[PDB]
């Protein structure tokens, strides 16, 4: 019986000359510690094509842990031409 | 004369607590398909303010069908800072 799994996603806007990756993230700063969750994903977008799903947790962005990111960094990385994510998800049942 | 209607509900909270959405689910399996129903809605809670009703059927949570969710995923999803539901309800004035 398999629980969550972690996988690496890499997205490049150059694939289809897109201006966005087609997802959103909710960032909670509780106790001062931070977690990042996927809020929504566009079905036809680059993120969806690489397997990102609503409710996934983002453990790392560009090899940096979620708790090590701030608003400035987040906005910077998410707007760049390419993006790496370390994602924790539940397998599709 | 309208019967049931289906609509999307999106809810957001500022913490990671399991019970803060203000609703509970009941479950029934028929013909090898599990269905989820809203058991109770907290009168002043988040879900109520978004129009979730007791007796509503939950078709999907975070884009996953009700029959494709297990108890671990449920607890997780219900504790995240955002939640997406596809809901079937009867119109109310």
């Amino acid at each position: 019986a398999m629980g969550k799994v972690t996988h690496s996603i890499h997205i490049e806007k150059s694939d289809t000359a897109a201006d966005t990756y087609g997802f959103s993230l909710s960032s909670v700063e509780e106790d001062g510690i931070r977690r990042l969750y996927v809020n929504s994903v566009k079905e036809t977008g680059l993120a969806s094509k690489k397997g990102l799903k609503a409710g996934d947790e983002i453990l790392e962005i560009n090899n940096r842990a979620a708790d090590a990111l701030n608003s400035s960094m987040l906005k910077d990385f998410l707007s760049q031409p390419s993006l790496g994510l370390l994602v924790r998800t539940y397998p599709e049942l | 004369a309208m019967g049931k209607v289906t609509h999307s509900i999106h809810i957001e909270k500022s913490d990671t607590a399991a019970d803060t959405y203000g609703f509970s689910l009941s479950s029934v399996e028929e013909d090898g398909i599990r269905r989820l129903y809203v058991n109770s809605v907290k009168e002043t809670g988040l879900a109520s303010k978004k129009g979730l009703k007791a007796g509503d059927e939950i078709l999907e949570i975070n884009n996953r069908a009700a029959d494709a969710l297990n108890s671990s995923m449920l607890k997780d999803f219900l504790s995240q800072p955002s939640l997406g539901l596809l809901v079937r309800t009867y119109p109310e004035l």
Binding site: T20, S24, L25, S26, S27, V28, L78, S79 | E12, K13
Partner: peptide, 7 residues
């Protein structure tokens, strides 16, 4: 503390 980010 809660923020939303679009990408």
């Amino acid at each position: 503390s809660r923020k939303e980010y679009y990408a």
